[PDB]
């Protein structure tokens, strides 16, 4: 449990939730400012692999991706089982900065291409930490707890899929291999 995960005491997935925090420093304080019985911290280190740019052999060889699959215990692709899930709430916790947004996009790319019925079942959530420039690491153990660790005070955004044919085009454009379509999107939307 030093750089790896710290799990929830409850064996029931309806009661328990997993928080994918951003950075080492965020992982430590979130492991301290949690409800050990219901809350499980998986600290993610560095930028997570863009699955839309990578081939399967590389995706499965990644230890960041492998840690998540082992934590949810759902399986990937065609062997994904919504019922065989360890948690009912998968919370993306990231810095309130531009790189925090980036990590959030990379995680959703993996979940959309490999664990699609997890998002459809409304299991995927986005934690809402205070915006003001500081970021997760700079926060104290008790500030971290009353900010987003109490599902009382906390405000989570339920990730929902409304148009799968539009989402497919969106992930392939933003996270794909073709720069020109990405460059166009930036040029147009600024």
């Amino acid at each position: 449990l030093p750089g790896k995960l710290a799990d929830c005491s409850s064996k029931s997935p309806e009661e328990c939730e997993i928080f994918l925090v951003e950075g080492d420093s965020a992982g430590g304080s979130t492991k301290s400012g949690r409800d050990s019985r219901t809350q499980a911290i998986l600290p993610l280190r560095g930028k997570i692999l863009n699955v839309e740019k990578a081939r399967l052999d590389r995706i499965l060889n990644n230890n960041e991706i492998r840690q998540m699959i082992t934590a949810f215990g759902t399986g990937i692709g065609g062997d994904f089982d919504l019922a065989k899930a360890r948690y009912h709430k998968i919370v993306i916790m990231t810095d309130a900065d531009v790189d925090g947004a980036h990590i959030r996009t990379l995680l959703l790319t993996f979940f959309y291409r490999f664990m699609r019925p997890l998002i459809e079942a409304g299991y995927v959530y986005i934690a809402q930490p205070p915006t003001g420039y500081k970021g997760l690491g700079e926060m104290n153990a008790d500030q971290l707890w009353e900010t987003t660790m109490n599902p009382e005070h906390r405000a989570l955004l339920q990730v929902k899929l409304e148009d799968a044919i539009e989402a497919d085009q969106t992930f392939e454009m933003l996270m794909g291999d073709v720069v020109e379509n990405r460059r166009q999107f930036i040029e147009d939307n600024a």
């Binding site: 531009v98 790189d99 947004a101 980036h102 959030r104 996009t105 959703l108 959309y112 998002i119 986005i126 955004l157 339920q158 990730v159 929902k160 899929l161 409304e162 148009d163 539009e166 989402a167 969106t170 992930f171 933003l174 996270m175 999107f185 930036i186 939307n189």
Partner: peptide, 15 residues
């Protein structure tokens, strides 16, 4: 709630 396409478009453009 939060749309998946909207979050992808908004967050990626920000970065």
């Amino acid at each position: 709630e939060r749309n998946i396409t909207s979050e992808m478009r908004e967050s990626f453009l920000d970065y």
